Design a protein around this ligand. Sequence first.
Ligand SMILES: CN1CCN(c2ccccc2CO)CC1
Length: 209
Amino acid sequence: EVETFAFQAEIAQLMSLIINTFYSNKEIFLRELISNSSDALDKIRYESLTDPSKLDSGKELHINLIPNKQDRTLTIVDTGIGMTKADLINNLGTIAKSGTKAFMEALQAGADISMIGQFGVGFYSAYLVAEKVTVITKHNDDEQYAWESSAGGSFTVRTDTGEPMGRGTKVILHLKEDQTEYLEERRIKEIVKKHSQFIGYPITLFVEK
Ligand SMILES: CN1CCN(c2ccccc2CO)CC1
């Protein structure tokens, strides 16, 4: 059972801008998603400070980067607080409508796309490099769900029957044909060292073969 939803008009306009604007500094997508992951790990850590059973779904707090050249996917896995179904609808737990508003006035006032994270909509920078994004998530208070969108004004949500996650979020980037450099080990290491050197959780870059 798959449910199809329309993006709010402002979010559709944000993704079309991300997709269509000429902007060469695409690598910032990884910084934004890792920062999103760190924020979600912060949230479950804070909750566990007064309720340790919140970590019964997993004590380890980490970020994994999993490239797969055969599938042409880069997957960012974290064991953060995760998202409810209601969170996935309602723009993956963001205040994306007001964030897009502020972002788009900043762009007309001199800002560039790299500053997207300052407006709380950094997730959508995934579409700098991805033709399709799948988000698998598990929150302690809900079941495991799969969100998916190839942009074009709509997204789907369905119950995820795949491999259980315990708790956290998995962002699967189905990369554009000309963006496969972000599957190369040395390129990912360079981006992580450049932009994510002060993330307070272990970031593990998986290798292939
Ligand atoms: C609500 N916060 C915004 C960033 N988040 C997010 C959104 C979509 C995909 C992945 C993530 C990170 O786990 C969760 C934390």
